[PDB]
Amino acid sequence: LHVGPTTIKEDVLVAGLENNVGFTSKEFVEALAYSLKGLRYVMGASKNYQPLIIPGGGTSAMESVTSLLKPNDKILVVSNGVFGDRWEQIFKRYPVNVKVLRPSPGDYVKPGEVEEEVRKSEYKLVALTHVETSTGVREPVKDVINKIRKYVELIVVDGVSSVGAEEVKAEEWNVDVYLTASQKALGSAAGLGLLLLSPKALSILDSQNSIAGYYLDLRNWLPVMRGAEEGKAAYFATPPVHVILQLAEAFRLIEKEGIENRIKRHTMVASAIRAGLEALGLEIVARRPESYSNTVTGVILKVADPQKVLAGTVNEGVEFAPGVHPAFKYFRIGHMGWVTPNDAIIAISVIERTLRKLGEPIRFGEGVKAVEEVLFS
Amino acid sequence: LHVGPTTIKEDVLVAGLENNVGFTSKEFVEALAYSLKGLRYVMGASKNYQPLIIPGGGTSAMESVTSLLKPNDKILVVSNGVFGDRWEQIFKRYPVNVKVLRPSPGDYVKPGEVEEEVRKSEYKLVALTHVETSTGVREPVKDVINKIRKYVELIVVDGVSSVGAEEVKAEEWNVDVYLTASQKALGSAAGLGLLLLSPKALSILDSQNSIAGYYLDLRNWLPVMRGAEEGKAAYFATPPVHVILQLAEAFRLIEKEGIENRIKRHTMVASAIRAGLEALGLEIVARRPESYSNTVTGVILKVADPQKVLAGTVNEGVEFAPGVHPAFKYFRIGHMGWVTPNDAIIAISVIERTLRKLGEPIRFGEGVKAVEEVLFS
Ligand SMILES: *Cc1c(COP(=O)(O)O)cnc(C)c1O
Numbered sequence: 193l194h195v196g197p198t199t200i201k202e203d204v205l206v207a208g209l210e211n212n213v214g215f216t217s218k219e220f221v222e223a224l225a226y227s228l229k230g231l232r233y234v235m236g237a238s239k240n241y242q243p244l245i246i247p248g249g250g251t252s253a254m255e256s257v258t259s260l261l262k263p264n265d266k267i268l269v270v271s272n273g274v275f276g277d278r279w280e281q282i283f284k285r286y287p288v289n290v291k292v293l294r295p296s297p298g299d300y301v302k303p304g305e306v307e308e309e310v311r312k313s314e315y316k317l318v319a320l321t322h323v324e325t326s327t328g329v330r331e332p333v334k335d336v337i338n339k340i341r342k343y344v345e346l347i348v349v350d351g352v353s354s355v356g357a358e359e360v361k362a363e364e365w366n367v368d369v370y371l372t373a374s375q376k377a378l379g380s381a382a383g384l385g386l387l388l389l390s391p392k393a394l395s396i397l398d399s400q401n402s403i404a405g406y407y408l409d410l411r412n413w414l415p416v417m418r419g420a421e422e423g424k425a426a427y428f429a430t431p432p433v434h435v436i437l438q439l440a441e442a443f444r445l446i447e448k449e450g451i452e453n454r455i456k457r458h459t460m461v462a463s464a465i466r467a468g469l470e471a472l473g474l475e476i477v478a479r480r481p482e483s484y485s486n487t488v489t490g491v492i493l494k495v496a497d498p499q500k501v502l503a504g505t506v507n508e509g510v511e512f513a514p515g516v517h518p519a520f521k522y523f524r525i526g527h528m529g530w531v532t533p534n535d536a537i538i539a540i541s542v543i544e545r546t547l548r549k550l551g552e553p554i555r556f557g558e559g560v561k562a563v564e565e566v567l568f569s
Numbered sequence: 570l571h572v573g574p575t576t577i578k579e580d581v582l583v584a585g586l587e588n589n590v591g592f593t594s595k596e597f598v599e600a601l602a603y604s605l606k607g608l609r610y611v612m613g614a615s616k617n618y619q620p621l622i623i624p625g626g627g628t629s630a631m632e633s634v635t636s637l638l639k640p641n642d643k644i645l646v647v648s649n650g651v652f653g654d655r656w657e658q659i660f661k662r663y664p665v666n667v668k669v670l671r672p673s674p675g676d677y678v679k680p681g682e683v684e685e686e687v688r689k690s691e692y693k694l695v696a697l698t699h700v701e702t703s704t705g706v707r708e709p710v711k712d713v714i715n716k717i718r719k720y721v722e723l724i725v726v727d728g729v730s731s732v733g734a735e736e737v738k739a740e741e742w743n744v745d746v747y748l749t750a751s752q753k754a755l756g757s758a759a760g761l762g763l764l765l766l767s768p769k770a771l772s773i774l775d776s777q778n779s780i781a782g783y784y785l786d787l788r789n790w791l792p793v794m795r796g797a798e799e800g801k802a803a804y805f806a807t808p809p810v811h812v813i814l815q816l817a818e819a820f821r822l823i824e825k826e827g828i829e830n831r832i833k834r835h836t837m838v839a840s841a842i843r844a845g846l847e848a849l850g851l852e853i854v855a856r857r858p859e860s861y862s863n864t865v866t867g868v869i870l871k872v873a874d875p876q877k878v879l880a881g882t883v884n885e886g887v888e889f890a891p892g893v894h895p896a897f898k899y900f901r902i903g904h905m906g907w908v909t910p911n912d913a914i915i916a917i918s919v920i921e922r923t924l925r926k927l928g929e930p931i932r933f934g935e936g937v938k939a940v941e942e943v944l945f946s
């Protein structure tokens with residue numbers, strides 16, 4: 193159970209075995225069109241919102257937002273950790289003005305604090321992170337946007353670790369760019385960044401110049417996306433053909449389960465794992481319980497070394513992820529994509545026996561029952 | 570037989586079925602390290618030259634060359650067609666000065682003509698296209714560089730349609746960036762750009778700032794590549810994990826065949842197809858025979874409509890590519906990757922019976938024997 197689930201459904205991987213398929217083939221065009229619709233479905237938007245699928249991943253999707261910007265534009269980044277900070281690292285490469293709001297480690301920036309800033313100063317674009325993967329902290333995006341919508345021209349949300357697992361309502365919340373990647377809660381193969389654009393965002397692409405480069409200017413990919421939905425092949429640059437076939441199959445499986453059911457499963461599994469961690473007497477990295485993400489949980493270690501924990505759990509049946517925040521000593525549990533109640537049982541079981549052998553103060557024999565209790569309901 | 574072979578060896582595709590693999594997994598690191606070595610092998614360079622594998626394709630690799638540039642730098646593009654012109658389209662997005670040399674349609678810029686230009690004006694960077702896919706014309710890279718090396722700081726070669734099929738000697742010819750993509754003559758799945766950098770190029774990355782963006786700044790990927798070759802996992806941004814597994818398998822097959830043998834096979838197959846076209850009384854797009862590429866041949870049609878030819882060949886057993894040059898009426902044959910002598914026989918057979926039904930003036934009964942004659946030796 194890692195950041196970037198390493199286990200992909202077999203149906204999804206097998207979908208990439210289709211041969212004699214290139215970017216002009218009707219099989220590809222159909223898979224692209226289907227994925228584009230699937231993006232609207234998981235982000236909750238009507239045909240008024242424009243999906244785009246581009247090469248790379250969450251980072252190339254984030255940088256592609258420069259397609260909506262002009263020199264000297266003012267940007268406010270609301271950063272809860274590493275991947276909030278990535279917006280700033282990206283925008284440092286561009287002729288734009290950036291201000292960043294940050295909270296105390298492992299906490300989150302309150303809607304009122306964002307409201308105060310956007311009311312004081314004029315901002316073209318506000319960047320949010322739905323789930324900050326470094327800390328497992330979920331920002332209350334609906335509440336933030338409710339406060340700020342009328343003060344700012346554009347709102348972008350990095351949903352790389354939220355889309356397909358947390359409630360996302362891109363149209364209803366009036367988001368201008370909601371973006372994700374193929375390999376996280378969508379549970380498909382890596383190599384694609386995914387974006388959903390509002391009418392207002394689309395009008396910028398269609399009517400204005402921008403500070404974008406070439407490969408990541410969303411204007412260059414738009415004819416390919418519009419084309420696909422009209423059943424037409426187009427060429428800008430060669431896309432990851434087989435990765436997109438795999439993506440269409442992931443979306444077929446997501447629609448089959450149903451997005452509401454998928455969200456509920458993530459909520460149940462995450463609450464169950466958290467229950468187990470608490471019953472073990474382990475502390476969660478996320479400071480505020482209302483922001484406990486349903487995809488990532490950081491697990492503070494008071495005595496044991498997190499590397500030893502990572503090495504010891506793999507030889508016991510589960511792979512987790514390391515902690516990457518100077519303020520905490522921790523490891524992370526990724527619980528996203530196709531994660532099941534049974535995975536929750538195994539994760540806590542493995543955590544218990546690994547921490548036992550490494551001398552972390554825990555309450556033995558309590559983890560799994562706590563998990564079972566939640567799943568029992 | 571299309572631009573971007575649509576048929577991928579089964580061994581290569583199957584390699585992408587490996588599950589429970591992420592960017593930190595030893596299986597991935599090993600596949601990345603192996604592909605990096607494979608790049609040195611097919612481009613003919615010692616360990617002094619630094620390989621990098623990045624997301625996207627030939628276009629993202631091309632744009633990543635901005636990592637070596639500074640504002641107001643002077644660039645000379647030697648463009649024989651569409652993909653030479655792409656260098657200009659990319660560089661239009663950056664604060665650089667660009668001059669383009671072009672030849673007559675279907676011709677190529679002679680080493681002496683590039684020499685004259687680089688002596689008259691001082692250029693930081695010269696961009697070449699090894700094989701121009703739009704016309705099937707191969708630029709004499711060695712000869713060009715022999716003339717210009719002493720007059721220019723940096724030389725980059727787009728080998729997207731040459732690497733793994735044409736002789737490439739990146740170190741011996743003293744190229745600073747030689748680049749390609751995963752899906753052309755390497756015959757692997759799409760989604761990766763590949764670069765090989767000289768020590769001089771590497772010193773620029775290590776010691777200077779640049780005009781690059783974020784995702785395509787080669788400085789950001791360098792720690793991941795150096796890491797891999799030391800057997801260490803690193804993270805900049807998530808790479809196309811399974812596409813890279815497929816790439817390592819392609820490289821295993823290429824080393825098994827041997828690169829010299831692979832080049833010889835392309836030479837034989839291409840000469841055979843050309844012999845068959847000539848014997849049919851068909852004219853090749855490439856104006857100068859010394860530049861007939863071994864990966865792409867353009868086929869001029871005097872009477873028949875190229876679209877009809879494309880539609881008619883697919884329902885006869887082969888898919889070709891359309892012509893994309895305002896100066897010619899033609900279709901293209903892609904003959905690269907895993908192409909065999911038998912594919913050459915089939916291609917000419919299919920061309921003969923398709924052109925017959927469409928009223929193109931040809932010499933019937935002569936194509937296949939001409940092909941067989943060349944293979945005969
Ligand atoms: C992993 C991640 C990213 C970066 O995505 P890549 O696909 O690795 O470029 C961006 N934002 C968040 C929240 C992430 O978790």
Ligand SMILES: *Cc1c(COP(=O)(O)O)cnc(C)c1O
Nearest residue numbers: 429430626627628652702729750
């Ligand atoms: C196809 C091609 C490119 C572009 O590569 P992508 O993978 O499509 O970005 C660049 N140069 C040449 C010569 C090509 O044939």
